[PDB]
């Protein structure tokens with residue numbers, strides 16, 4: 001062990017052996033610089049936790065580095081921060097930076113920490129290039145973030161102009177049972193989670209059972225920038241953005257719920273770039289969609305194949321349900337005007353979504369909304385394949401023959417989908433079952449010791465006077481003088 005000051009904490013962690021347990025006494029640990037270099041062992045991790053979670057706060061000009069392996073950080077509350085604004089950057093290490101593999105951060109609270117730009121948690125490469133793998137971030141709460149960059153960055157490469165066929169190695173991390181709710185920042189200010197950087201990177205990370213409630217940081221709720229990542233059973237409630245397959249082919253999104261249940265803002269949504277994806281059993285019910293992106297539930301990116309804005313084609317869209325979406329259920333050519341100019345400027349060949357396998361999807365609408373189910377300005381007969389879908393409530397918008405018989409609707413059986421190496425999920429079995437369960441609630445994800453939801457944005461879409469002030473200062477110093 002029990003430590004009650006920063007200095008004794010520093011000492012014990014330098015001495016702790018595998019299987020060790022370091023418990024932090026109730027109190028505030030201000031300007032704490034926790035650097036854990038020792039390592040635990042498989043089956044004998046080193047645990048650093050609050051003796052009484054909820055009573056230990058890491059504050060001030062703080063920082064945590066998990067450099068060894070088999071380490072666990074649990075039950076810590078990060079608040080009242082004061083890191084130097086001229087010392088931290090977006091794309092740099094997070095407040096908590098994980099540099100070693102097999103590490104876990106669980107049941108921790110990050111609430112409007114400070115004004116220094118950075119992610120709250122990151123897996124970062126050491127100076128010699130080694131990439132952290134097999135880490136887990138779970139049951140953590142991330143609220144009222146007023147700084148730039150994502151809440152979480154999972155890195156397997158360093159930032160560089162890029163595009164050398166080379167790509168970062170698979171990471172195999174897992175992000176589950178976390179809560180994300182943060183205020184809207186201007187422009188491409190960093191969203192909820194980023195995984196990887198370019199299409200040649202391999203991710204193989206599992207993001208499941210997370211609750212994003214008014215995760216409004218920016219247009220991207222999650223910007224998945226690496227191959228073979230699996231998003232399963234996540235709930236996105238009233239989020240001003242979309243969950244994206246931004247870079248990297250062969251990504252999976254199964255049984256996620258995208259719900260917009262009021263008229264306060266435009267909600268999303270999934271925006272898809274790239275090919276060979278598996279989008280199945282997702283439930284979309286959006287009371288309002290995003291005007292800037294085209295007003296739809298699912299956006300399929302038009303553009304140049306395998307480019308910076310990779311064309312969306314050759315993928316499986318099965319057993320999804322689009323219920324009373326106030327916008328198009330599927331937009332087949334969003335932002336086509338900009339994309340066509342982008343391709344022209346870069347001497348690329350502009351193309352539009354095709355080779356799409358749409359199977360067993362349900363499209364339904366019975367509310368006074370004005371949008372037909374689909375928008376495809378570049379429709380070509382037979383470019384896509386439609387089987388076992390059901391549509392009724394409004395015009396389809398495109399010349400496609402679809403059953404209107406709801407009573408006969410049934411999800412289809414899929415059995416030719418290969419699982420993702422490193423992720424223990426039977427994709428065929430999950431897809432074939434159809435949509436299971438329902439939206440996740442706070443009690444299903446919150447830290448075991450935390451009863452009430454931190455912050456104010458999730459429930460009020462407003463920040464306190466003190467926090468709104470800091471947020472404005474952050475935004476202002478990052479904009480033209």
Ligand SMILES: CC(=O)N[C@@H]1[C@@H](O[C@@H]2O[C@H](C(=O)O)C[C@H](O)[C@H]2O)[C@@H](OS(=O)(=O)O)[C@@H](CO)O[C@H]1O
Pocket residue numbers: 187188219220335338
């Ligand atoms: C350089 C680049 O293409 N970045 C894209 C980003 O696009 C920029 O930002 C916007 C916008 O937020 O509306 C429009 C212009 O395309 C460009 O200045 C954006 O892509 S988008 O075109 O789909 O919007 C984001 C995803 O939201 O992805 C970045 O890579």
